[PDB]
Ligand binder design. Structure first.
Ligand SMILES: CN(Cc1ccccc1)Cc1cc(C[C@H]2CNCC[C@H]2CC(=O)Nc2nccs2)no1
Length: 330
């Protein structure tokens, strides 16, 4: 089997991407944030505290004839910012782009933090990291990809995120028309539960490539590119007027600037992020100070190849017995 679904930016800045997912019988379609940095499939639901729902579509398990309460199971997640959610668990039928999993754990939110309530366009998350990170207790549950894997034509999924445009998540096959040149594969460590890999270095604009190992995670659920302070400083030094602002919480730059590209290494291959991918617009409405899309990872503890990086590539998440990651230009 295979699946193919379109993923769509939630706003004009590509802050996140939503992908429609069918849950239950009859289908209830929710727009989920596919997140390769986490491993829970959780949704706003009929059980979510009413005051914490503001526009989201909800999953109502009582209306699904294939929903079964997973007795005693709870979940609770705290993501890397300050956001959180928690609740109970059903198993149900879940389909993505024509690919169907029966008995998928669907984690129903009873509580969500304000940041999620404020995201009217995001009905929940679909985790695509390794199942070792799944938070369900007392019996950990598998991700959608792990459940589907054995049935797929090939044990892979791909992310093809658009810049200011829709893109695609494919399961079970490589669309050879979706990229240029070849796919360069690189080793993954699953020790922290992430799609963790090591970039071979970087260039800023037309500058010379710096060979240096940068360990980080491929994370579709993070908006920006978080890299070591030395690398980030080198990038922003090429933008006149750019500075790190403690009050704003990162590098900002004059909205009148032309941003240079940023290149990252994948083995001997090179992925080029165009300068305009690095613009996240005015820090507040009407401001002429703009927020940068490349930021320091120093306060995080890990480097993160988020959407800013990933949307410059066609990315293969290879779930073979020894997983690997593939990157192609497009
Ligand atoms: C990428 N820019 C950088 C920036 C930083 C500062 C100034 C400009 C630009 C940050 C950014 C903004 C947004 C969209 C916002 C929409 N309103 C509510 C807040 C935002 C939505 C949001 O953060 N949801 C969350 N859910 C869970 C955890 S956080 N998503 O990201």
């Amino acid at each position: 089997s295979t699946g193919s679904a379109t993923t769509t930016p939630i706003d004009s800045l590509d802050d996140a991407y939503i992908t429609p997912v069918q849950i239950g019988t009859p289908a209830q379609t929710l727009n989920l944030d596919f997140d390769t940095g986490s491993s829970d499939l959780w949704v706003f639901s009929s059980e979510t505290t009413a005051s914490e729902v503001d526009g989201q579509t909800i999953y109502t398990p009582s209306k699904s004839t294939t929903a079964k309460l997973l007795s005693g199971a709870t979940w609770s997640i705290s993501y890397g910012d300050g956001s959180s959610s928690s609740g109970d668990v059903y198993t149900d039928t879940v389909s993505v782009g024509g690919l169907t999993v029966t008995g998928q754990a669907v984690e129903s939110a009873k509580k969500v933090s304000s940041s999620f309530t404020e995201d009217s366009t995001i009905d929940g998350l679909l985790g695509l990291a390794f199942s070792t990170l799944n938070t369900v207790s007392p019996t950990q549950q598998k991700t959608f990809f792990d459940n589907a894997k054995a049935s797929l034509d090939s044990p892979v999924f791909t992310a093809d995120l658009g810049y200011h445009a829709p893109g695609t998540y494919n399961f079970g096959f490589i669309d050879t028309t979706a990229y240029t040149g070849s796919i360069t594969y690189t080793a993954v460590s699953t020790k922290q539960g992430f799609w963790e890999w090591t970039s071979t270095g970087y260039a800023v604009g037309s500058g010379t490539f710096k060979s240096t190992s940068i360990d980080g995670i491929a994370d579709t659920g993070t908006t920006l590119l978080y890299l070591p302070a030395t690398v980030v400083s080198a990038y922003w030094a090429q933008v006149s007027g750019a500075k790190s602002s403690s009050s704003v919480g990162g590098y900002v730059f004059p909205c009148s600037a032309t941003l240079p590209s940023f290149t990252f290494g994948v083995g001997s291959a090179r992925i080029v992020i165009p300068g305009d991918y690095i613009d996240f617009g005015p820090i507040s409405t009407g401001s002429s100070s703009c927020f940068g899309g490349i930021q320091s990872s120093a306060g995080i503890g890990i480097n993160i190849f988020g959407d800013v990086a990933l949307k410059a590539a066609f990315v293969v998440f290879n779930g073979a017995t020894t997983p690997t990651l593939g990157f192609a230009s497009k």
